[PDB]
Design a protein around this ligand. Structure first.
Ligand SMILES: [Mn+2]
Ligand SMILES: [Mn+2]
Ligand SMILES: [Mn+2]
Ligand SMILES: [Mn+2]
Ligand SMILES: [Mn+2]
Ligand SMILES: [Mn+2]
Lengths: 314, 314, 314
């Protein structure tokens, strides 16, 4: 089965430059070559060139609305292109705002898709709830169907159409929620397993339930959106919004391991990896190895080990 | 419901000076104002002046017995006073030996109360079993009813009256216990979950069984004494007696979260946070930041998030 | 209940020097003295003088076959001697390749013994499957009954007799396995708990299932081989092949505590602790402290604490 790497060197999703350097870091560490070693076929799409919109005046509080809006539209145009030819889409980003390109492009070809959002935030505010005009923490808002019309239209997001409903997605690793956000998720009653939950049940029971909830009834493709800030700052320090007491290195692979196991992974997002934010070359090396590591896990590489079929090693 | 912050800048309890700075370290970090942000009312009682006793000769091994006694007596006098006006007490200490006063004053108004001791030690040595005349490691030996008269009367501790029995207390996070201490808890049969127990059951099940143990039969107030050294040093640096293999930030959080949920916490202790014992300013910020995290957990703040009632954020 | 420490300062098991200094590291940290504080009797059998074989040409890929084979032959003979007199055999190593002598000496006197292999690796390659001629990562290949005659006879290992079968052994914390290795364990179907396992069950249930799998039917002596690298480097950094995402200082103790709990320990190995590889004295002090923390545990020392029998501390 096909795999297509699509770099998204973008960052206007937030105030700290540097995340457009993620792709270049991930590829540098050896992601593309490490993947060709798996049972899959790998075609690297290269890095998309994001045209900058001049005079991108702020829509109320939101910053860079036409820029962010334009990039994502170019992303969702690319994604549909690989998913159309039946090939799994791995997007190497920038900030999370690129999810709107990532998941909108996915749904065009697999409208019945679900989403597992591994993040420490819901990154799902509305241009009416953000205390910051930053769109990297609003990706979901623009996606949700039940959120259509619950906030103004934002210059550059006309092309967007709510693709998934509050029933088809599940958060994992939440720990920093704004009053606003907590409201929405409760009100719309979305399924999540916040830090608290993943203390009480354990990452073992948590993927068991998230699977019966999303795949309990019908079998449908999986779109995994992984904010490196999902695991703790001791495993991913090179991120813009780090937050204490997160998901261990282990539960992370566990996650990515089980998702492989479903044979249902359709879209994968490796967002917000920032090489310039590492306090030491180590932490940058740390954040990337564990970013690559999770990316190889969603594609077979197990911790008990692997071996090539039909090969008698004796 | 009322909350009353009581400043206990005491340290005589032990040899390492620096703990009487705890309050000033927790207040500085924003504890007081952080709390008024919750659904509760907050009145800061201020820091109690502790009269020093001249010529506080040592009773055999014990050190500063009269000094440590009078303070506590003035602590139970302040506590009992605010609990009388139906308000929850949060004591920012010093060394733990002040618990003596926080639990003694508490029981005068709620004599049927229980105690969830989260710490790395049992601080239950008798003036006869301590290898150090230190009182921060004995607060319990004085409170226990089954321990009345199993050791000599210590000058300054005549006013004390064992308010609780070996039945109404459970320990959490035990890992450093002295031969004498383990004996006592085995003999009197106290309910505990030593780190070994938390690895076995999970911080999930553990809180499930400690609740049905202390609250399976009758519903009573919860006095929560928390020795910062309760968690591992990696999280709680700036503590006098740090001991490897401790309770994570997450577990110490899941505990406090659940103590809220009961709606039964009555008295709270935030003991042994030492500012001067931090190897770097970071480590002083850290322990503090997470001593605060917990204090704001005991009162609502959830990781999944919080939103104000009756407010429609849409 | 006899204990016999046996220093095996060997290292030819791999390319990095330093491991021979292990014993002389554990010993300084005060291992022997600390053990005498337990309920056991202690006899330190000094360190073994290992004669170096001149002109130890490489058998195909394998390196130091004759020097490694001779050393172990001399270890096994020391071992089988103190097990003979009814004493427990604790071996402070070098490189793990000395397991071969440690477990070989052990099966002579207790041919019905079991082994719990706590290590980040399976150390079970064959001279035909190694990518390196390193014997520290093959010990098991020489011990297995099912592996007899699955490779060529290696110079110096003519004295070795497969003593345990695929059935009496179990791994714990595997997270780095080469293609070959995985195959083997799969094919001979060995009972293990990779890191994924420990995540999904917990160090609680894990020991429950390893005990009922190894001791469910008959009660037999337990040989515990502990590759310090089985833990996470943050706990055991001073090691030759560290690997991210290991067991916690807490599971590590949990494990050694339950093994004490059976009353069946018989043989114990504390291999591959290398003092020269700690980036800082601290990492050397750390690692060491826990190759002992763990040992003094296999002999009782409980985190809940201990107290001497018949001694009324009141
Ligand atoms: Mn995000
Ligand atoms: Mn995030
Ligand atoms: Mn303590
Ligand atoms: Mn204490
Ligand atoms: Mn190993
Ligand atoms: Mn090994």
């Amino acid at each position: 089965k096909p795999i297509e790497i699509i770099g998204a060197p973008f960052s206007k999703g937030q105030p700290r430059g540097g995340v457009e350097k993620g792709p270049a870091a991930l590829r540098k560490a050896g992601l593309v070559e490490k993947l060709k070693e798996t049972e899959y076929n790998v075609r690297d799409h290269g890095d998309l060139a994001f045209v900058d919109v001049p005079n991108d005046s702020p829509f109320q509080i939101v910053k860079n609305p036409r820029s962010v809006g334009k990039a994502n539209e170019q992303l969702a145009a690319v994604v549909a292109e690989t998913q159309k030819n039946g090939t799994i889409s791995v997007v190497l980003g920038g900030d999370h705002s690129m999810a709107i390109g990532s998941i909108s492009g996915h749904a065009r070809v697999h409208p019945d898709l679900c989403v597992i959002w591994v993040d420490a935030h819901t990154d799902i505010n509305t241009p009416l709830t953000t205390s910051s005009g930053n769109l990297h923490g609003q990706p979901v808002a623009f996606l949700l169907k039940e959120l259509k019309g619950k906030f103004p239209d934002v210059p550059g997001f006309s092309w967007v159409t709510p693709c998934i409903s509050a029933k088809d997605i599940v958060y994992i690793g939440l720990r920093d929620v704004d009053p606003g956000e907590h409201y929405i998720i409760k009100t719309l009653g979305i399924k999540y397993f916040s830090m608290t939950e993943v203390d009480k049940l354990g990452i073992g029971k948590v993927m068991e339930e998230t699977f019966s909830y999303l795949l309990g009834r019908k079998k449908r493709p999986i779109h995994l959106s992984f904010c490196v800030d999902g695991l703790d700052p001791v495993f991913t320090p090179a991120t813009g919004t780090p937050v204490v007491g997160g998901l261990s290195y282990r539960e992370g692979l566990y996650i990515t391991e089980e998702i492989y196991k479903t044979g249902l992974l359709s879209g994968l997002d490796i967002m917000e990896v920032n090489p310039t934010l590492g306090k030491t070359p180590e932490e940058v090396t740390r954040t990337v190895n564990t970013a690559v590591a999770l990316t190889l896990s969603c594609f077979g590489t197990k911790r008990e080990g692997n071996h090539k079929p039909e090969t008698d090693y004796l």
